């Protein structure tokens, strides 16, 4: 309108909080391949 | 991380139903009235 534009400017405000979880680690899984594949069985450990 | 061990069994548990009769399987197999393949006979042995 002439040289001027209509703008909504804030007249009041507050502070808002926002949470953000970022994963940086995970459970350190470890496998005993021999115990998993063959358990206690000697005949399996031989073939493995 | 060394290979997985298992605790050694310290005793043996053996269970069987006592005082069951003999199955007599030989008496039935040695019976001289032998059937042909056409009329092959069956016997079922349990609790013996
Ligand atoms: C701003 O907003 C808060 C919450 O609605 C209110 O308590 C406060 O009086 C307001 N201030 C003005 C200048 O409007």
Tab-separated table of N, CA, C and O in Angstrom, chain B residues 4-48:
chain	number	residue	atom	x	y	z
B	4	UNK	N	33.729	-70.669	26.038
B	4	UNK	CA	32.762	-70.916	27.091
B	4	UNK	C	32.953	-72.276	27.754
B	4	UNK	O	33.063	-73.296	27.075
B	5	UNK	N	32.962	-72.298	29.080
B	5	UNK	CA	32.894	-73.523	29.867
B	5	UNK	C	31.442	-73.849	30.242
B	5	UNK	O	30.525	-73.045	30.069
B	6	UNK	N	31.210	-75.042	30.776
B	6	UNK	CA	29.945	-75.449	31.410
B	6	UNK	C	30.279	-76.177	32.706
B	6	UNK	O	31.242	-76.947	32.737
B	7	UNK	N	29.535	-75.937	33.787
B	7	UNK	CA	29.794	-76.639	35.055
B	7	UNK	C	29.635	-78.147	34.869
B	7	UNK	O	28.706	-78.604	34.205
B	8	UNK	N	30.553	-78.945	35.418
B	8	UNK	CA	30.483	-80.405	35.283
B	8	UNK	C	29.342	-80.963	36.136
B	8	UNK	O	29.149	-80.498	37.260
B	9	UNK	N	28.605	-81.973	35.659
B	9	UNK	CA	27.571	-82.608	36.453
B	9	UNK	C	28.208	-83.382	37.609
B	9	UNK	O	29.136	-84.161	37.401
B	10	UNK	N	27.732	-83.169	38.832
B	10	UNK	CA	28.315	-83.783	40.037
B	10	UNK	C	27.734	-85.160	40.362
B	10	UNK	O	28.301	-85.894	41.169
B	11	UNK	N	26.606	-85.517	39.752
B	11	UNK	CA	25.871	-86.754	39.990
B	11	UNK	C	25.061	-87.154	38.749
B	11	UNK	O	24.915	-86.366	37.814
B	12	UNK	N	24.533	-88.379	38.741
B	12	UNK	CA	23.635	-88.871	37.687
B	12	UNK	C	22.266	-89.234	38.249
B	12	UNK	O	22.153	-90.037	39.178
B	13	UNK	N	21.206	-88.700	37.657
B	13	UNK	CA	19.827	-89.069	37.975
B	13	UNK	C	19.332	-90.059	36.936
B	13	UNK	O	19.207	-89.721	35.766
B	14	UNK	N	19.024	-91.283	37.337
B	14	UNK	CA	18.462	-92.301	36.459
B	14	UNK	C	17.115	-92.743	37.006
B	14	UNK	O	17.047	-93.184	38.150
B	15	UNK	N	16.045	-92.624	36.217
B	15	UNK	CA	14.691	-93.022	36.621
B	15	UNK	C	14.087	-93.965	35.581
B	15	UNK	O	14.127	-93.701	34.377
B	16	UNK	N	13.496	-95.053	36.056
B	16	UNK	CA	12.766	-96.079	35.307
B	16	UNK	C	11.604	-96.566	36.159
B	16	UNK	O	11.731	-96.619	37.377
B	17	UNK	N	10.489	-96.961	35.557
B	17	UNK	CA	9.394	-97.563	36.327
B	17	UNK	C	9.836	-98.968	36.765
B	17	UNK	O	10.249	-99.754	35.913
B	18	UNK	N	9.799	-99.307	38.061
B	18	UNK	CA	10.266	-100.595	38.552
B	18	UNK	C	9.233	-101.704	38.342
B	18	UNK	O	8.050	-101.442	38.144
B	19	UNK	N	9.670	-102.956	38.461
B	19	UNK	CA	8.805	-104.145	38.537
B	19	UNK	C	7.909	-104.403	37.311
B	19	UNK	O	6.964	-105.190	37.380
B	20	UNK	N	8.197	-103.781	36.168
B	20	UNK	CA	7.511	-104.091	34.917
B	20	UNK	C	7.825	-105.526	34.457
B	20	UNK	O	8.953	-105.991	34.638
B	21	UNK	N	6.868	-106.234	33.841
B	21	UNK	CA	7.078	-107.589	33.348
B	21	UNK	C	7.998	-107.617	32.126
B	21	UNK	O	8.210	-106.603	31.461
B	22	UNK	N	8.530	-108.789	31.790
B	22	UNK	CA	9.266	-108.978	30.539
B	22	UNK	C	8.337	-108.896	29.322
B	22	UNK	O	7.178	-109.307	29.376
B	23	UNK	N	8.839	-108.385	28.200
B	23	UNK	CA	8.034	-108.232	26.992
B	23	UNK	C	7.759	-109.556	26.257
B	23	UNK	O	6.848	-109.608	25.439
B	24	UNK	N	8.525	-110.626	26.502
B	24	UNK	CA	8.370	-111.936	25.836
B	24	UNK	C	8.440	-111.900	24.297
B	24	UNK	O	7.874	-112.756	23.615
B	25	UNK	N	9.144	-110.923	23.721
B	25	UNK	CA	9.163	-110.707	22.269
B	25	UNK	C	9.647	-111.960	21.529
B	25	UNK	O	9.094	-112.341	20.499
B	26	UNK	N	10.634	-112.661	22.083
B	26	UNK	CA	11.146	-113.903	21.514
B	26	UNK	C	10.075	-114.996	21.457
B	26	UNK	O	10.027	-115.735	20.479
B	27	UNK	N	9.179	-115.099	22.445
B	27	UNK	CA	8.132	-116.130	22.436
B	27	UNK	C	7.158	-115.916	21.293
B	27	UNK	O	6.703	-116.879	20.685
B	28	UNK	N	6.848	-114.661	20.981
B	28	UNK	CA	5.975	-114.339	19.863
B	28	UNK	C	6.686	-114.509	18.524
B	28	UNK	O	6.117	-115.089	17.604
B	29	UNK	N	7.944	-114.087	18.405
B	29	UNK	CA	8.711	-114.292	17.176
B	29	UNK	C	8.985	-115.772	16.891
B	29	UNK	O	8.923	-116.179	15.735
B	30	UNK	N	9.250	-116.593	17.907
B	30	UNK	CA	9.513	-118.025	17.743
B	30	UNK	C	8.243	-118.887	17.639
B	30	UNK	O	8.339	-120.109	17.569
B	31	UNK	N	7.048	-118.300	17.645
B	31	UNK	CA	5.810	-119.062	17.518
B	31	UNK	C	5.741	-119.747	16.143
B	31	UNK	O	5.804	-119.078	15.116
B	32	UNK	N	5.595	-121.072	16.105
B	32	UNK	CA	5.681	-121.847	14.865
B	32	UNK	C	4.521	-121.645	13.875
B	32	UNK	O	4.625	-122.082	12.728
B	33	UNK	N	3.427	-120.993	14.270
B	33	UNK	CA	2.291	-120.710	13.390
B	33	UNK	C	2.495	-119.417	12.577
B	33	UNK	O	1.781	-118.431	12.751
B	34	UNK	N	3.525	-119.379	11.735
B	34	UNK	CA	3.999	-118.163	11.057
B	34	UNK	C	3.013	-117.677	9.982
B	34	UNK	O	2.610	-118.474	9.136
B	35	UNK	N	2.623	-116.394	9.937
B	35	UNK	CA	1.731	-115.864	8.912
B	35	UNK	C	2.455	-115.569	7.597
B	35	UNK	O	3.661	-115.319	7.577
B	36	UNK	N	1.723	-115.537	6.487
B	36	UNK	CA	2.259	-115.084	5.195
B	36	UNK	C	2.295	-113.554	5.099
B	36	UNK	O	1.609	-112.887	5.870
B	37	UNK	N	3.013	-112.954	4.134
B	37	UNK	CA	2.955	-111.523	3.903
B	37	UNK	C	1.539	-111.025	3.649
B	37	UNK	O	1.234	-109.903	4.016
B	38	UNK	N	0.642	-111.813	3.056
B	38	UNK	CA	-0.723	-111.351	2.799
B	38	UNK	C	-1.466	-111.021	4.099
B	38	UNK	O	-2.189	-110.031	4.162
B	39	UNK	N	-1.273	-111.820	5.145
B	39	UNK	CA	-1.950	-111.694	6.430
B	39	UNK	C	-0.966	-111.408	7.564
B	39	UNK	O	-1.135	-111.928	8.663
B	40	UNK	N	0.059	-110.595	7.303
B	40	UNK	CA	1.101	-110.261	8.271
B	40	UNK	C	0.510	-109.842	9.615
B	40	UNK	O	-0.439	-109.064	9.678
B	41	UNK	N	1.034	-110.388	10.699
B	41	UNK	CA	0.516	-110.147	12.043
B	41	UNK	C	1.271	-109.018	12.730
B	41	UNK	O	2.468	-108.862	12.507
B	42	UNK	N	0.594	-108.286	13.618
B	42	UNK	CA	1.168	-107.241	14.474
B	42	UNK	C	1.007	-107.601	15.938
B	42	UNK	O	-0.067	-108.044	16.340
B	43	UNK	N	2.013	-107.307	16.754
B	43	UNK	CA	1.897	-107.268	18.214
B	43	UNK	C	2.499	-105.979	18.753
B	43	UNK	O	3.498	-105.493	18.231
B	44	UNK	N	1.866	-105.392	19.762
B	44	UNK	CA	2.280	-104.122	20.363
B	44	UNK	C	2.803	-104.385	21.768
B	44	UNK	O	2.090	-104.957	22.590
B	45	UNK	N	4.023	-103.952	22.064
B	45	UNK	CA	4.648	-104.123	23.367
B	45	UNK	C	4.792	-102.778	24.075
B	45	UNK	O	5.462	-101.859	23.590
B	46	UNK	N	4.189	-102.663	25.252
B	46	UNK	CA	4.271	-101.480	26.106
B	46	UNK	C	4.209	-101.854	27.581
B	46	UNK	O	3.743	-102.936	27.930
B	47	UNK	N	4.720	-100.982	28.453
B	47	UNK	CA	4.823	-101.237	29.893
B	47	UNK	C	5.544	-102.556	30.222
B	47	UNK	O	5.086	-103.336	31.054
B	48	UNK	N	6.665	-102.823	29.557
B	48	UNK	CA	7.453	-104.032	29.748
B	48	UNK	C	8.940	-103.773	29.506
B	48	UNK	O	9.304	-102.850	28.780
